[PDB]
């Protein structure tokens, strides 16, 4: 490795070649690996699940890229191929970065409900929390629909009222 630990992200002026898109095939693959691995870490460490591409372009070190639009579209394409990312919709303006899948979210949420003594949960009560483990309270509404389905399917919950996204927690031990 030319550089280690994404040290190029910490001081962009010292590593300016990391901010130009390379044109040679070999160089471009290795650049893309570095930025794709970085961007996955940046979302995970910031416990962020989604964000518009224009907002991403205002954040260090993405803010130092030349051809921001073209550089992000190829990084995102790479994260999609590696099964860590999806665009949010057909307008291709925002991305959803899956550094954790729904099956793991469902255990994080179940364990938190047990540890906090809750016997029922609603979507509203979760999204109105002051804070939560790994910012689960910030997951998009569609992700909650799927997480609650998983909890019910897996016998860890049952529906009190599904049209209100309201579940009862089922106890095992």
Numbering used by the authors: 1 to 173
Sentences from the paper on this structure:
This is striking as Vps25 is the subunit of the ESCRT-II complex in eukaryotes that recruits ESCRT-III to membranes, triggering vesicle budding.
Eukaryotic ESCRT-II forms a ‘Y-shaped’ hetero-tetrameric structure consisting of a Vps22/Vps36 stalk which binds two Vps25 subunits. In the case of Odinarchaeotal Vps25, while we were unable to crystallize the full-length soluble protein, high-quality crystals could be generated using an N-terminally truncated version (deleting N-terminal residues 1–58), which were then used to determine the structure at a resolution of 1.80 Å. Inspection of this structure revealed that the Asgard Vps25 core is composed of a tandem WH domain repeat, consistent with the predicted AlphaFold 2 model. Because of changes in the relative orientations of the WH domains with respect to each other in the tandem arrangement of the three Vps25 homologues, overall alignment gives much higher all-atom RMSD values of 3.5 Å and 5.1 for the yeast and human proteins against Odin, respectively. The same appears to be true for the Asgard ESCRT-II machinery which, based upon modelling of Vps22 and Vps25 proteins from Odinarchaeota and the crystallographic Odinarchaeotal Vps25 structure, possess two very similar WH domains.
